[PDB]
Design a protein around this ligand. Structure first.
Ligand SMILES: Nc1ncnc2c1ncn2[C@@H]1O[C@H](COP(=O)(O)OP(=O)(O)O)[C@@H](O)[C@H]1O
Ligand SMILES: [Mn+2]
Ligand SMILES: [Mn+2]
Length: 356
């Protein structure tokens, strides 16, 4: 079994996604995403071997007929998904990058002499890396896996197949205290002006933590307003809001549509309703009460009510979120909020492995 991602980190954390070029993985239909992992010889889990984009049904090349059942098998692109590490842990960042590059060289040899065969659980020649196979019911095939023989491909990685996910303490969003927080606050959907706006709206209120409440308000309001902007732009069905009722033609399959996720640029990966937990019951009520008018002064009553209710009931920004991540003291853990960089910016390029 592939180990689950560690959930706790002392400070800011980073995870990477690396979609490979030059090969496919074929597995039975409805198989688990994870088929293995790469760890250091010391035992530290570095990255998962996963199936990503469905490339169509698998057809075993006739010249490689082996008496085995490949019925209903599907071909997918391979994506190397790192196990998160501390952002300032130079060794852990580099080991992940080096392990990913080694596996690409291993994959290059695999498609040359073992085309249409599963990966074997092996140790690297230098002893640094170990492959663990959790699902042996898979095959690795060159290119798109139609031909029995390869085109002598070198397995590569490129910025277009790359993503990064940054995890920060939820209390820090809006503080601009660290370079990571400043980078996340630069998100085009984040409106820092909403912090001072909340302070102006709550002068007569005796709040437990005024600065924290303003930070949570700005964060949540920015997400709620962007969701309403995207629902209007892309014609998305949110809760009971019908885009067609406002003469909007749908041009996206929902909140999880790649182009909707790309429109965020810095995509929130944590359930918005989780942040309410970092505040007192009183402060959370004060924050939540002030969000509705921000939506209603910019969007229709139906869109405003539907966006507000969706996130209030624990609605996700773009599908299943990473909601169990924590930061700080191991014994008294604080909520961590995650963000996916749809395109890796210049500030995070050093965390990504490069073939060239
Ligand atoms: N605690 C965490 N801190 C930072 N990054 C994390 C954390 N947990 C998971 N990640 C990263 O989030 C990403 C999730 O990968 P994945 O499961 O394939 O998600 P998805 O299907 O939404 O693309 C990985 O790159 C992983 O390293
Ligand atoms: Mn992924
Ligand atoms: Mn992703």
């Amino acid at each position: 079994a592939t180990p689950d991602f560690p959930t706790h980190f002392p400070k800011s954390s980073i995870g990477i996604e690396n979609e490979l070029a030059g090969l496919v993985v074929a597995m039975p239909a409805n198989s688990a995403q994870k088929f293995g992992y790469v760890k250091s010889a010391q035992g530290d889990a570095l990255f998962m071997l996963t199936k990503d984009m469905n490339q169509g049904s698998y057809q075993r090349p006739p010249s490689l007929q082996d008496g085995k059942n490949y019925q209903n098998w599907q071909t997918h692109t391979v994506e190397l998904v790192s196990y998160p590490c501390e952002m300032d842990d130079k060794a852990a960042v580099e080991t992940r990058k080096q392990a990913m590059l080694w596996l690409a060289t291993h994959f290059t040899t695999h498609i040359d002499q073992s085309n249409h065969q599963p990966l074997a659980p092996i140790q690297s020649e230098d002893g640094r890396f170990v492959i663990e196979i959790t699902n042996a019911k898979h095959v690795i095939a060159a290119g798109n896996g139609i031909s029995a023989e390869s085109q002598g491909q070198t397995i590569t990685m490129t910025p277009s197949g790359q993503q990064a996910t940054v995890g920060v303490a939820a209390k820090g969003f809006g503080t601009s205290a660290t370079p990571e927080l400043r980078l996340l606050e630069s998100a085009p959907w984040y409106q820092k002006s909403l912090k001072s706006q909340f302070a102006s709206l709550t002068s007569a209120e005796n709040l437990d933590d005024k600065e924290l409440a303003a930070n949570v308000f700005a964060y949540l309001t920015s997400i709620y307003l962007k969701t309403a902007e995207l629902a209007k732009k892309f014609g998305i069905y949110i809760n009971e809001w019908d885009p067609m009722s406002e003469q909007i033609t749908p041009n996206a399959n929902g909140l999880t549509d790649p182009k909707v996720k790309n429109a965020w640029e810095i995509l929130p990966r944590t359930k918005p309703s989780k942040i309410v937990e970092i505040l007192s019951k009183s402060d959370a009520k004060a924050v939540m009460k002030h969000i509705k008018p921000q939506l209603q002064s910019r969007y229709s009553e139906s869109l405003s009510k539907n966006v507000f209710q969706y996130f209030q009931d624990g609605g996700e920004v773009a599908g299943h979120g990473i909601n169990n991540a924590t930061v700080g003291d191991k014994h008294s853990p604080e909520l961590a909020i995650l963000f996916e960089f749809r395109t890796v910016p210049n500030e995070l390029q050093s965390y990504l492995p490069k073939t060239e």
